[PDB]
């Protein structure tokens, strides 16, 4: 009977940096996905392996909602099969992804005068991330052999004067898992 609390996800007062991306577990509730699909406030709403209309007809055992901020250039990396700084080193979708990727421009909230530095991404890692892996370490990366050593995170520095490719976007990734277990999230 409880309605799925998507507002705590899409309307949260803080979003995570992408290297420390947040995961919300959604359970034991009814979700109307069309309410979101038809708001017209989303510059991205791309569903993989399912249609958003059919999604209100379906039940799942859990729904995961992963959210973070990236720059607009990098929204295309939040998709099955992609490479890049974000896909390889921050947030990686499986090639078989069944879910939806929702994004919107947040320049009026996430930039600030002189730059907003709170949002970081990982620039260097020893290997690519596995799907849905998270790395929050702050170890100095070695590109060489001395104890050519770099701090592994870089700030986005969001500026209100940037063009759209460099403006901040809030992203929400909905994963629908279907397991041989009781389903708890239905439309």
């Amino acid at each position, epitope marked *: 009977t409880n309605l799925c609390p998507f507002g705590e996800v899409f309307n949260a007062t803080r979003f995570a940096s992408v290297y420390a991306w947040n995961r919300k577990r959604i359970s034991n509730c009814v979700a109307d996905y069309s309410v979101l699909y038809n708001s017209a406030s989303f510059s991205t709403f791309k569903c993989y392996g399912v249609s958003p209309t059919k999604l209100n007809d379906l039940c799942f055992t859990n729904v995961y909602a992963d959210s973070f901020v990236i720059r607009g250039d990098e929204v295309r990396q939040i998709a099955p099969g992609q490479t890049g700084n974000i896909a390889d080193y921050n947030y990686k979708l499986p090639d078989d992804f069944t879910g939806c990727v929702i994004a919107w421009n947040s320049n009026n*909230l996430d930039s600030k005068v002189g730059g907003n530095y709170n949002y970081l991404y990982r620039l260097f890692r020893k290997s690519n991330l596995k799907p849905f892996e998270r790395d929050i370490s702050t170890e100095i990366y070695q590109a060489g052999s001395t104890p050519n050593c770099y701090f592994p995170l870089q700030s986005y520095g969001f500026q209100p*004067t940037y063009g759209v490719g460099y403006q901040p976007y809030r992203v929400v990734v909905l994963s629908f898992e279907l397991l041989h277990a009781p389903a708890t999230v239905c439309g």
Partner: antibody
Amino acid sequence: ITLKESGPTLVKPTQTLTLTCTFSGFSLSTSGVGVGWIRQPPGKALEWLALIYWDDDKRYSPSLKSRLTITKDTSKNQVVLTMTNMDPVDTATYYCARHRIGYIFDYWGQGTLVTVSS
Amino acid sequence: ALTQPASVSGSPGQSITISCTGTSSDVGDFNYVSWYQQHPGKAPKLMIYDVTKRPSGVSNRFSGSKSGNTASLTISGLQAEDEADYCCSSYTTSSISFGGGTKLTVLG
């Protein structure tokens, strides 16, 4: 809904200005909100001075940065500006106002006249 | 950083425009422009924000637009009541910028 600077103040040259903004109707803890300080010298242009965000990020005029400080106290709903080595060219009305990026500044205070003179 | 004409003049009933030019190296894509009205000895009042939007309670006679690095405040159906100085505001990569006023004189 409201912002109000502290009272009009005479300031001796080389000494330091201190102003306090007291606001009501909104919290400086809510995301995206800031409170900034802007001045207008008699017959001259508005000049942005300083800004403080909900998360305590601080930003200043690049040319005046070494003389400025801004502080917030969300419990007292007040924001405090300090400026040093005051000179008669700094005689101006001093305004506080609410910031949110999308609109730059919406609600302004009435302004308070600061006079630098021996 | 922001440059405005010192004065503009319009006759009652007609429409007038005040232009606001930002240096290309300072304002980037020039995304957020606000317009303020200030009456003598009084605080600025927000008339247009985000280039084109009106706060509630501002009359539809005030409108804002942009083209390249020049934003424009347009006032239609000029009334004597709206003589004032009109000031634009925008961002640079380091600060908030204003540039000088435009005194609007309603003629006749």
